[PDB]
Amino acid sequence: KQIEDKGEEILSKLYHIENELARIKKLLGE
Amino acid sequence: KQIEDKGEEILSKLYHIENELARIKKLLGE
Amino acid sequence: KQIEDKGEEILSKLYHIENELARIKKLLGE
Amino acid sequence: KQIEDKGEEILSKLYHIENELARIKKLLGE
């Protein structure tokens, strides 16, 4: 359950990261 | 294998992040 | 717990990626 | 060993990603 909690935690950061990069790509295209 | 399954899903996110970075590096003319 | 240990190391990388994105978003004046 | 191999694989992508972002930050600062 530690390994499963770390797993989710990792995913949720990755969603945050992919959103920051989408925001960068959007800016740069404007 | 829930954990195996998570591994794969995490990696998938990483590929997609790599696609975003390729888009970004093109916009920055590098 | 080698796998637990890996989890933590992965997360650490994600934080650092987040620091880089904060630096990048400042350089892009966003 | 599948979980341990996925672990390494994830790390190695993250190193690639942190390098792409360092290259972005360097460019933008030049």
UniProtKB/Swiss-Prot annotation, chains A, B, C, D:
Expression induction or repression: Translation is induced by amino acid or purine starvation, or during growth in low or poor carbon sources. Translational repression during nutrient-rich conditions is dependent on four uORFs (upstream open reading frames) present in the 5'-UTR of the mRNA; these promote ribosome dissociation. Translational induction occurs in conditions reducing translation machinery efficiency, leading to ribosomes scanning over the uORFs, and increased translation of the mRNA. The rapid translational induction is followed by transcriptional induction at later time-points, independently of the uORF sequences.
Top-level taxon: Eukaryota
Disruption phenotype: Abolishes recruitment of the mediator complex to the upstream activating sequence (UAS) of amino-acid starvation responsive genes. Decreases RNA level of genes involved in amino acid biosynthesis and cofactor biosynthesis during amino acid starvation or methyl methanesulfonate stress. Growth dependent on amino acid supplementation. Sensitive to amino acid starvation. Sensitive to purine starvation. Decreases cellular glycogen levels during glucose starvation.
Location of the region described as Leucine-zipper in the Swiss-Prot/TrEMBL record: 3-24
Post-translational modification: Phosphorylated by the cyclin-CDK PCL5-PHO85.
Subcellular location(s) per record: Nucleus
Family membership: Belongs to the bZIP family. GCN4 subfamily.
Protein task: Master transcriptional regulator that mediates the response to amino acid starvation. Binds variations of the DNA sequence 5'-ATGA[CG]TCAT-3' in canonical nucleosome-depleted 5'-positioned promoters, and also within coding sequences and 3' non-coding regions. During nutrient starvation (low or poor amino acid, carbon or purine sources), it activates genes required for amino acid biosynthesis and transport, autophagy, cofactor biosynthesis and transport, mitochondrial transport, and additional downstream transcription factors.
Assembly mode: Homodimer. Each subunit binds overlapping and non-identical half-sites that flank the central CG base-pair in the pseudo-palindromic motif 5'-ATGA[CG]TCAT-3'. Interacts with the mediator tail; the interaction with GAL11/MED15 is direct. Interacts with the SAGA histone acetyltransferase complex. Interacts with the SWI/SNF chromatin remodeling complex.
Domain statement: Residues 89 to 100 and 106 to 125 define the N-terminal activation domain (NTAD) and the central acidic activation domain (CAAD) respectively, which can function independently to promote high-level transcription of the target genes.
Identification of the protein by name: General control transcription factor GCN4
Organism the protein comes from: Saccharomyces cerevisiae (strain ATCC 204508 / S288c)
Phylogenetic classification of the source organism: Eukaryota, Fungi, Dikarya, Ascomycota, Saccharomycotina
Gene for this chain: GCN4
